[PDB]
Design a protein around this ligand. Sequence first.
Ligand code: AV0
Ligand code: AV0
Ligand code: A1D7S
Ligand code: A1D7S
Ligand code: A1D7T
Lengths: 641, 643
Amino acid sequence: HAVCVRHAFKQYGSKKNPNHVLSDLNMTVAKGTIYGLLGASGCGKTTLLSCIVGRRRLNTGEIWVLGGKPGTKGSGVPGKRVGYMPQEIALYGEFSIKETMMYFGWIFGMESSEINERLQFLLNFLDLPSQNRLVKNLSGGQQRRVSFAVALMHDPELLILDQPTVGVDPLLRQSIWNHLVQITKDGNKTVIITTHYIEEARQAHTIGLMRSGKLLAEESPHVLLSMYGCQSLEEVFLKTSWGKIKALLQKNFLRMWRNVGVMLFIFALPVMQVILFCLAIGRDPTGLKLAIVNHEKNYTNQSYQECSFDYGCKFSYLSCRYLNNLRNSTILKEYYPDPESAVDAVKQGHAWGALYFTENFTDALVARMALGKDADPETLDQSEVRVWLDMSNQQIGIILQRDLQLSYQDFAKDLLGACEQNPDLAEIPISFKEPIYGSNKPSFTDFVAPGVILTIVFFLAVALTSSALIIERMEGLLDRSWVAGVTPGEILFSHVVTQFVVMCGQTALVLIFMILVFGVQCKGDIGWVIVLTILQGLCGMCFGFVISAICELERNAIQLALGSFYPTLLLSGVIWPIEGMPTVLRYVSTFLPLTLATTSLRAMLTRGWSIAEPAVYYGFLATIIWIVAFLTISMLVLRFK
Amino acid sequence: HAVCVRHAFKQYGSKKNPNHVLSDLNMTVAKGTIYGLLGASGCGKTTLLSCIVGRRRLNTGEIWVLGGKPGTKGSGVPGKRVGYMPQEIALYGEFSIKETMMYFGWIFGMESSEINERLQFLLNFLDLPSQNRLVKNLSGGQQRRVSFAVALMHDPELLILDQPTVGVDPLLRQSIWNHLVQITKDGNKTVIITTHYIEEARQAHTIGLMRSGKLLAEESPHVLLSMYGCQSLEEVFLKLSTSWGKIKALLQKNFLRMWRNVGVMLFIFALPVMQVILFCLAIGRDPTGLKLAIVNHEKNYTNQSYQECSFDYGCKFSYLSCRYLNNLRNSTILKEYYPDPESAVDAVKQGHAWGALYFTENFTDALVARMALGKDADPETLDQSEVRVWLDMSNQQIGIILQRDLQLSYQDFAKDLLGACEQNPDLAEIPISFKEPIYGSNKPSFTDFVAPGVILTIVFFLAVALTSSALIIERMEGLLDRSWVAGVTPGEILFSHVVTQFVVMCGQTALVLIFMILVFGVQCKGDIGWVIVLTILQGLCGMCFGFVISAICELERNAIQLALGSFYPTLLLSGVIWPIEGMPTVLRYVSTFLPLTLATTSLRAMLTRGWSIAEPAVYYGFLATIIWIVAFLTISMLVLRFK
Ligand SMILES: CCCCCCCCCCC(CCCCCCCCCC)(CO[C@@H]1O[C@H](CO)[C@@H](O[C@H]2O[C@H](CO)[C@@H](O)[C@H](O)[C@H]2O)[C@H](O)[C@H]1O)CO[C@@H]1O[C@H](CO)[C@@H](O[C@H]2O[C@H](CO)[C@@H](O)[C@H](O)[C@H]2O)[C@H](O)[C@H]1O
Ligand SMILES: CCCCCCCCCCC(CCCCCCCCCC)(CO[C@@H]1O[C@H](CO)[C@@H](O[C@H]2O[C@H](CO)[C@@H](O)[C@H](O)[C@H]2O)[C@H](O)[C@H]1O)CO[C@@H]1O[C@H](CO)[C@@H](O[C@H]2O[C@H](CO)[C@@H](O)[C@H](O)[C@H]2O)[C@H](O)[C@H]1O
Ligand SMILES: CC/C=C\C/C=C/C/C=C\C/C=C/C/C=C/CCCCOC[C@H](COP(=O)(O)OCCN)OC(=O)CCCCCCCCCCCCCCCCC
Ligand SMILES: CC/C=C\C/C=C\C/C=C/C/C=C/C/C=C\CCCCOC[C@H](COP(=O)(O)OCCN)OC(=O)CCCCCCCCCCCCCCCCC
Ligand SMILES: CCCCCCCC/C=C\CCCCCCCC(=O)N[C@@H](CO)[C@H](O)CCCCCCCCCCCCCCC
């Protein structure tokens, strides 16, 4: 015998209503015969064939094919001794008709010499087009012929065909059946074929009709047809492992290269957004305008005042002397005649402030500087600059305030120096010494970059892994490759290697553009930064594993990834210090995947701390624990599935 | 006559790559007959049927159905009087059988009991389960009998069936053929059925063999059998050489398809609410638990949490180093005490503090003599009268807080020293006097700056996702083309989708505005009337961008890449999380032409300043959003015409 199904049982659904399909079978197939499995719906027999090959299991009963159990020991149905054609077209669209045969030839372990001979034979037999045409460019009928060629190409000894003749010209279906009869008659082979044209399967040596959940009858066509003296069959029915890893790796690196959309999305988007972020976010505002109502000098234009004075003693004007100390980068002076037009300009939106030096500014400032603590109230109001600022914008309102006081500090120090005096006399008692861990003029982009790097690397892996594992299982490609002999260990190993290479390339590009091209500093060790980025990428890949394990449609996976991409970015302190959140939220947010990693990377970049500091290796510990947790969850989900 | 095709020519692809499907075809179907159309591929027959019903055109030919050109002036093909069942299953999975039949009964214009009678007949005839069973729960073979009942329910004069008897038992095959023959017999009922089981097609009154884009034999089957001498139908094949009633039905279906999908409700209604809550709790607030290492050598040292800082509030300036620390802000600075200046700095070099203070052992003697000597202070008293602060300035937003809190606390210290001895506190003020701000307050919030940019981005990009996905999904499964044959114009399809989306972001705008303004106290100094109008106008601009993506994309997974490929660059160029003044001179000029750059600036002016529509900075965001609505419609209309 070849297959000895006995007392088979199966049921879909749940306890509320189990879909009772394929119950209490009795099927047997002998060597050298063309079996025929006929039915009504194209899924009561697909389940049986899937159970026979080994990609599914029966609830009760015994199953026996080609020596032993379908897929553990003795039998060879998960091996190269069975040819399988899935009901759908389980083929890759980026391959030629020659590469799509060389791939399976390497998977089945055949020498490359015989593949060409069998390729020419199958091309002659099936009159397929030129062997260099891509599969995705073929029509819907030649794909089935290519799949038939792939099924026959390795010379199996038990052919299991799932509707091979549906959209085929009858002048070719006749040849197909003749070929099956030829190879089965004398060879030590067997054929199991399911068809929808009951009358077509007249050359089968045995026909088993499937009705409800069991084989209705089992007999040769002649005896079955002559039992009732029928005229038609429809009337009766109306009563080494390294060789299989290289091929997977090559196909994985080729499928990503012939799809320009994927290459763009996962290689030119990170670079573009890194460039945009470095060019736009974090820089100091420039070009801010001011309204100057300096009444100590005559008014000529709105862009000219003739601010001239003396750089020595005698303190000529001291209102042009102060304005000379204002920074020329972030402030552009504009001149107005009276203190009402200036505030009107601020109100309408033509400026950010007003100054209004009083016409008695010098004669009162040089009196305040000399009188000291015994100064009358008159020479304390006519010796001041009155600033009406626009505080609707926080960042712009901070820079203006800071630069209107640093300029006065420089003004006072210059006054003291030009008078041959100690310049420390113009200093507040609070004395800010050299910063311990930074510079006196910090930047905001150096705070956001370690946390944009990790965000990019983490969230560009979940999508790729989820899509690659969803659009491949749902198309019947993983199941087709499994029957060829590829164990699940090799598929996972190849996928991990491919994803590792992709994330290594992404990390290289992002770190080259952030640190070398632009001015983002790195005071720590670059090797540990690379290791942390790669570990975050692996954590993202494990999250993609979980997402693809619990999801079955490619549109639900994107929703699930997007629903978790926002809160983690908003809670991990990427764009604002984590010290601002409330106490309860600050404790919850440290258990998220990206919080401690971002903190440790920021410490590495902006302080230079080694690996021994707890604030540095807590990120590594958190990332490793999250990888382990994601792997455990992914394995647990696939238990009841 | 019912259908007349002459000299039909049709091909796909470009000029370089020819894909001739039909070329010099001749067809003729009488009235009261079953045609039957047998082929090989499975796509030429579908193309011929699509050309007959009107959903596809002919490159060169002449088609005459039911009176005239199919869908131009006098042929009743694009509406009722025809029954079309597509090759696929164009059915809605959220509806039961009864709702599915009632929707198509209302589309055609039948009554509420003339649908129930047909339901009662067809359920018994086709052997279907109870009418209260959802379609998605039905098996793959029971979703085809439902389509057959939908096609046969309204009793048209021309049934066009595409592979009816597939995935069905032979008994039901014979029953269906018997019913077709019965309805056709002695009447004006015409059937055109493209079956694949060749031998079953002998019951027809004509046979339509197709090969190489033409028709070899177009004749009766009893003549086909006894003209070639063959006794078969397969072996002879082997011889080589009122618009308000239709908008209402579409609007009601649209809401029940979003209400019955719980995952869709959470993504478009419960996700914006969660984003708003987490933004107001995390982003913008000032740091609070900052720690400082304090070395006060004017007092005995006991603990790392206790120093016994005491002084006299009145006068005589007892200690003045505990007096200054008394003025430090208790909310955002925590005080920890260390015994040596060198031991406190080592605390900063680890993760234990943000600064050190180190008041000298003779701070009071030097400081009092410093302010009582004026400009005659010797260098020695300028050294022991100062506070030495070593800050950790790696963080920009914390170094600013610490620097400002340590100098503000000295203004209060000085203004209380003089003032407690009968002096004017104005003597302790720098000449630069900041009067009352014209706009805002002395303590602006960063979360008030980023707030306008979060409302606009949430609404804009949640309409791109909803419009693109709904239009791509319904078009690819034949649902949109099946409704067009029933008599629903493209005007009624677009009208019902615009209205369905309008109520979607009307609900979204209410929740985003309520939580941000009413609950979390984000100020709104302007008019709330114009904030709602501008926020809604951004939703329609986003929706019109959904039309563009769905017009040029066929697979859903490609739309996400296009939507996400433009969602990231805009947020970094529209000035949402940073002032637009930080950009370079050239990138700033380009950025203002993006959809959200000028609308965010306008909304920020109405919230944080109170400007009205009459200000140029406010209506420039209304005009820049009306222009992008027109541009997005022009781009999408050009693509459909050219493809
Ligand atoms: C870790 C390593 C994993 C392995 C490598 C990973 C890639 C492997 C999967 C590749 C993949 C997923 C990509 C999703 C990942 C990123 C999503 C992230 C989502 C972000 C939220 C990319 O899919 C490709 O994307 C192309 C973009 O270039 C796109 O082409 C479009 O834009 C082009 C641009 O101009 C434009 O030219 C082109 O005309 C457009 O069509 C097509 O959809 C497709 O070719 C899917 O592969 C696709 O599978 C298709 C069958 O479904 C297969 O179909 C073909 O053949 C069928 C015959 O069986 C036949 O029946 C189909 O009709 C036929 O079409 C495609 O050939 C194959 O490629
Ligand atoms: C202003 C415009 C007005 C338009 C209003 C109408 C819009 C409604 C569109 C509905 C839609 C688009 C979703 C768009 C996402 C929007 C965000 C964009 C993406 C983010 C960038 C929702 O899509 C559905 O979302 C469901 C979420 O609940 C999901 O359910 C999943 O998660 C659940 C939760 O955990 C979980 O409980 C549940 O178990 C899961 O199954 C469904 O599987 C998924 O298909 C697609 O509709 C779906 O279409 C399916 C066939 O295509 C159709 O399948 C049925 O039909 C066929 C036989 O009849 C046949 O195919 C199927 O055999 C049959 O089943 C579904 O019935 C129908 O629903
Ligand atoms: C927020 C608004 C901002 C700007 C608004 C607008 C500007 C213009 C207004 C309209 C113009 C354009 C909209 C976009 C269109 C463009 C038209 C053509 C695309 C037609 O797309 C066909 C198929 C899908 O085709 P398919 O599904 O197979 O259907 C068969 C049809 N042939 O796309 C795909 O696969 C692509 C999948 C994602 C591809 C990239 C994703 C992310 C990009 C990142 C790269 C950025 C770096 C730049 C690269 C240069 C450096 C080397
Ligand atoms: C950086 C982030 C990293 C980590 C974050 C944190 C912790 C990780 C622990 C992670 C473990 C799991 C999460 C998955 C959970 C659970 C399973 C569920 C779906 C399983 O799936 C079913 C199908 C798909 O099922 P289907 O495709 O039909 O296949 C048939 C199978 N039945 O999903 C769908 O429709 C869902 C489509 C999008 C639904 C929501 C999208 C956005 C959420 C926003 C709402 C937030 C507010 C909450 C609402 C409460 C207040 C009213
Ligand atoms: C239109 C397509 C989106 C469809 C759904 C849209 C629905 C509403 C959108 C946002 C809701 C508003 C909630 C936050 C959005 C705006 C408000 C804000 O505060 N935005 C900031 C933080 O979110 C801003 O984004 C900071 C970016 C800096 C880091 C950049 C790294 C980017 C990773 C690139 C690769 C990861 C790929 C992951 C999956 C590939």
